[PDB]
Amino acid sequence: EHPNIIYVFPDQYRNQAMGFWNQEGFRDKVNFRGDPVHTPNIDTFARESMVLTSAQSNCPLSSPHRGMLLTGMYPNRSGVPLNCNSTRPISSLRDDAECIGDVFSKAGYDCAYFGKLHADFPTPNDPENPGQYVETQRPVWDAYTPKEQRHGFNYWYSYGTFDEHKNPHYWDTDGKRHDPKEWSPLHESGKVVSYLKNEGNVRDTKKPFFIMVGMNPPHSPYRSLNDCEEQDFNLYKDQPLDSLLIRPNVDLNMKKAESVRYYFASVTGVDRAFGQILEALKQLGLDKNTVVIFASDHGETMCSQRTDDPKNSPYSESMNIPFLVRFPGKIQPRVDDLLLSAPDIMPTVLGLCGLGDSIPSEVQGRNFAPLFFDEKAEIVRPAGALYIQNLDGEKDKDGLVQSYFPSSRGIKTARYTLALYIDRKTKQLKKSLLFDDVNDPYQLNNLPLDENKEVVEQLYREMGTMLKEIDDPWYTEKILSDRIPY
Ligand SMILES: CC(=O)N[C@H]1[C@H](O[C@H]2[C@H](O)[C@@H](O)[C@H](O)O[C@@H]2C(=O)O)O[C@H](CO)[C@H](OS(=O)(=O)O)[C@@H]1O[C@@H]1OC(C(=O)O)=C[C@H](O)[C@H]1O
Ligand SMILES: [Ca+2]
């Protein structure tokens, strides 16, 4: 048969926010000082798994990522070019896409989704106050996902988005809303343990399972004890700011900097929650039977580059996501600088569960399962992964976004981060970031393009290839045709 799979992906979690990057072996495999975070469960897990230094969120923003995650397609084809909200009818997960849940399901898996989905355009949808939005907030951010639209998940315990961490809410398989008054991650984790124990007979123990856990923290808020457990907070409470924010690209004097205490608390708590899932696998013997992956949708600046916006930028702090894959006696624990792109996750996870031959044709990403199973595999490693920023385009008579402005395309290679920003009226180069991530890992030194013709010309060629391959708007609109060979 085919093994079980759990994909645990807390929102807004930097690859750099993991203890083990300062630990022996690991710390020699990355250019950065890891954040001073206490993540013991993940640290141990990392010594059992293939660990990437260089997984990329091509569009480091919730819905765009989730769209690539679930469909294995870039944001021009996922259905999901923008963050989902009542402003953006143009952005919602394609009904007609053959998603990760659909393939698993079609192959005999029970599939179960816990926590944040943030992939559907809000509608007056609400199962229990019908013809009504699920919240009053305008714009509307949250959404209910009916059985018709759950792409293979026969077990639902999930919201769209809602950032009260100790007052989260969930719709069950039947559309019943639940409001425990419990810190999201530890509730989500207890709820997963129950599904694993098959309490309430919610699952067929003869079928293998596919689980996704979309934890909200360590995403905003992170201002107070409303937003994390005092237990975790106690570790960072009194620590001076210059010993929490160690990245030399940080402005310690930003109103935001204080938030690091609570970010790290949410990180330590998320680790404790992941811990409960792992122990439940061991205590039930499912540990030997199950592919486990720890990931995020995008990172967090946390005052790095004075950005104030956690993400939606090409900085290593925004693009680089954790990616840890444990599959006992199929994957040797090791570190790998594979440049995995989000749309590669779905086909690679199917590869790993031996459903490589069931990858839908519409999928744009590639199946690196062979490379996970075999260090020494004749498989081509990517040269780069695309940077993508998509903004609101034009609006209609009723003030709704009905198109997207592709504000930035760029590339991350082994050595370089390049990001080109264009103007909405005159599709002309307006700002340009270029970093030598090897010599300038905190991206302090923005390199002029004119002073680097050999390097830039190569980056322009790799962007061209990739943008043409995914049939990206920059390609179809022959944007910067004058520097980018298509
Ligand atoms: C972090 C941020 O800048 N904006 C995100 C937003 O965060 C608000 C929270 O709801 C609140 O808890 C916190 O303390 O302050 C934020 C605020 O009031 O501005 O939450 C959104 C989801 O609930 C969303 O995050 S997302 O799910 O992770 O990706 C939002 O992200 C911003 O969204 C957009 C966009 O819709 O275009 C653009 C920004 O680049 C992105 O940072
Ligand atoms: Ca997010």
Report which protein residue has its CA nearest ligand 1's atom 10: 163
Q: Indicate whether residue 219 lines ligand 1 (CB < 6 A).
A: yes
- Comparing CA positions, the residue from 86, 171, 84 lying closest to residue 120 is 84
Distance between CA atoms of residues 8 and 386, nearest Å: 24
Residues 31, 36, 38, 39: what is their CA dihedral angle, to the nearest 10 degrees?
-30
CA-to-CA separations, 468 to 406, 426, 478, in angstroms, rounded: 15, 22, 10
d(CA 471, CA 138): 34
Distance CA 18, CA 40 (A): 9
Q: What is the distance of C-alpha 245 from the center of its chain?
A: 22
Find out whether the beta carbon of 312 lies less than 6 Å from any atom of ligand 1. yes
The neighbouring-strand residues paired with 295 are: 323
Residue 332 and residue 385 in one domain: no
Q: Which ligand is nearest to the CA of 392?
A: 1
One-letter amino acid at 227 equals D
Residue 289 corresponds to which tokens in the numbers above?
């039977």
Q: Which residues contact 195 (CB under 8 A, 6 or more apart)?
A: 112, 114, 155, 202, 203, 209, 211
**DSSP conformation letters of 141-173:** ------GGGSTT-SEEEEES----TTS--EEET
3-class secondary structure, 435 = strand
Determine whether the shortest distance from the Cβ of 310 to ligand 1 is under 6 A. yes
CA 194 to mean position of chain CA atoms? 25
Ligand 1 close to Cβ of residue 165 (< 6 A): no
Same domain assignment for residues 11 and 88:
yes
Sign of the dihedral defined by the CA atoms of residues 6, 10, 16, 19, in that order? negative
Q: Is the CB of 220 under 6 A from ligand 1?
A: yes
Q: How is 99-120 classified by DSSP, letter by letter? A: -HHHHHHHTT-EEEEEEE---S
Helix (H) or strand (E) holding 262: helix 260-283
Same domain for 98 and 218?
A: yes
Report CA(263)–ligand 1 centroid distance (Å): 15
Say which ligand is closest to the CA of 141: 1
Cβ neighbours of residue 443 closer than 8 Å, sequence gap 6 or more:
249, 305, 315, 316, 417, 433, 435, 437
Residue 391: partners with Cβ closer than 8 Å, 6 or more residues away: 82, 404, 405, 407
42 Cβ below 6 A of ligand 1 = no
Tell the burial category of 164 from Cβ atoms under 10 Å away from its Cβ (0-12, 13-18, 19+).
middle
Indicate the residue among 380, 406, 423 that finishes a domain. 380
Name the residue among 393, 414, 415 with its Cα closest to residue 405: 393
Q: Is the CB of 16 under 6 A from ligand 1?
A: no
Q: Which of 469, 222, 155 is nearest to 341 (CA)?
A: 469
- For the stretch 314-340, what's the b/e string if a residue is b when 16 or more beta carbons lie within 10 angstroms of its beta carbon? bbbbbbbbbbbbbbeebbeeebbebbb
Q: For residues 284 and 208, state if they share a domain.
A: yes
* Residue nearest to ligand 1 atom 40, measured at CA: 312
- Are residues 340 and 213 part of one domain? yes
Largest CA distance in the chain: 65
CA 398-79-299 angle, 5° bins: 100
Q: Which ligand is nearest to the CA of 10?
A: 2
Residues 367 and 441 in one domain: no
Q: Is the CB of 88 under 6 A from ligand 1?
A: no
Q: Which residue has the tokens 């034009």?
A: 394
Asked whether residue 362 falls in the same domain as residue 414, the answer is no
Q: Which residue, by CA, sits nearest to atom 8 of ligand 1? A: 220
Q: Which of 460, 472, 430 is nearest to 59 (CA)?
A: 472
Q: In this structure, which amino acid lies at residue 424?
A: R
461 three-state secondary structure? helix
Rounded to whole angstroms, how far apart are CA atoms 305 and 407? 19
CA of 24 to the centre of ligand 2 (A): 30
- Extract the tokens encoding 53: 């230094």
Q: What is the resolution of this structure in A?
A: 2.8
Based on DSSP, count helices (H) and strands (E) in the chain, helices before strands. 12, 16
Q: Determine the structural domain holding residue 319 and report its residue range.
A: 1-380
Q: Specify the ligand 1 atom closest to the Cα of 161.
A: 23
- Phi-psi category of 94—alpha, beta or left, where left has phi over 0 and alpha has psi -120 to 50? beta
Helix H or strand E segment including 463: helix 453-470
DSSP secondary structure code for residue 72 in this structure: S
**β-strand partners of 115:** 158, 214
Distance 215 CA to ligand 1 centre (A): 15
Buried b (16+ CB within 10 A) or exposed e, 347-381: bbbbbbbebeebbbeebbbbbbbebbeeeeeeeee
Strands 55-56 and 110-116: unpaired
366 and 238 share one domain: yes
Does 61 contact ligand 1 (Cβ within 6 A)?
A: yes
Do 242 and 130 belong together in one domain?
A: yes
Closest ligand to the CA of 296: 2
Residue 24's identity, in one-letter code, is E
Query: How do strand 50-52 and strand 334-336 relate by DSSP bridges?
Result: parallel
Three-state DSSP state, 467:
helix
Given a contact cutoff of 8 angstroms between Cβ atoms, the answer to whether 345 and 94 are in contact is: no
Contact 83, 183 (CB under 8 A): no
62 lines ligand 1 (CB under 6 A): yes
57's tokens? 């969120």
Question: From ligand 2's centre to the CA of 202, what distance in Å?
Answer: 29
Strands laid side by side in the 384-392 sheet: 384-392, 404-413, 416-422, 429-436
Do residues 339 and 395 share a domain?
no
Same domain membership, residue 157 and residue 101:
yes
- Strand 320-321 and strand 55-56: pairing? antiparallel
Q: Which of 365, 380, 395 is the last residue of a domain?
A: 380
Strand ranges (E), 202-241: 209-214
Which amino acid is it at 231?
Q
Residue 178 has phi, psi (to 5 degrees) of -130, 135
Overall domain count for the chain: 2
Length, in residues, of the chain: 486
In whole angstroms, how far apart are CA 390 and each of 64, 251, 329, 429? 9, 27, 41, 16
Sheet with 155-159, side-by-side order of all strands:
177-178, 170-172, 155-159, 110-116, 209-214, 4-8, 290-295, 323-326, 50-52, 334-336
Nearest residue to 212 (alpha-carbon basis) of 268, 265, 152, 269 = 152
CA distance 114 to 382: 32
Q: Which of 11, 61, 304, 391 to mutate to test the pocket of ligand 1 (most atoms within 8 A of CB)?
A: 61
CATH code (residue 331)? 3.40.720.10
Phi-psi label, residue 175: left if phi above 0, alpha if psi -120 to 50, beta otherwise:
left
Which of 380, 411, 443 is at the close of a domain? 380
Among protein residues, the one with the nearest Cα to ligand 1's atom 26 is: 62
- Strands 404-413 and 110-116 come out as unpaired
Supply angle C-alpha 85, 116, 124, rounded to 5: 40
Beta bridge partners of 392: 404
Q: How far apart are CA 407 and CA 388, in angstroms?
A: 8
Taking the centre of ligand 2 as the mean of its atom positions, its distance from the CA of residue 207, in whole angstroms, is 31
Q: Say if residue 44 is in the same domain as residue 165.
A: yes
Output the residue whose Cα is nearest ligand 1's atom 31: 61
Q: Is the distance from the beta carbon of residue 83 to the nearest atom of ligand 1 less than 6 Å?
A: yes
Task: Output the CA 8–ligand 2 centroid distance in Å.
Answer: 14
CA 297–ligand 2 middle distance (angstroms): 6
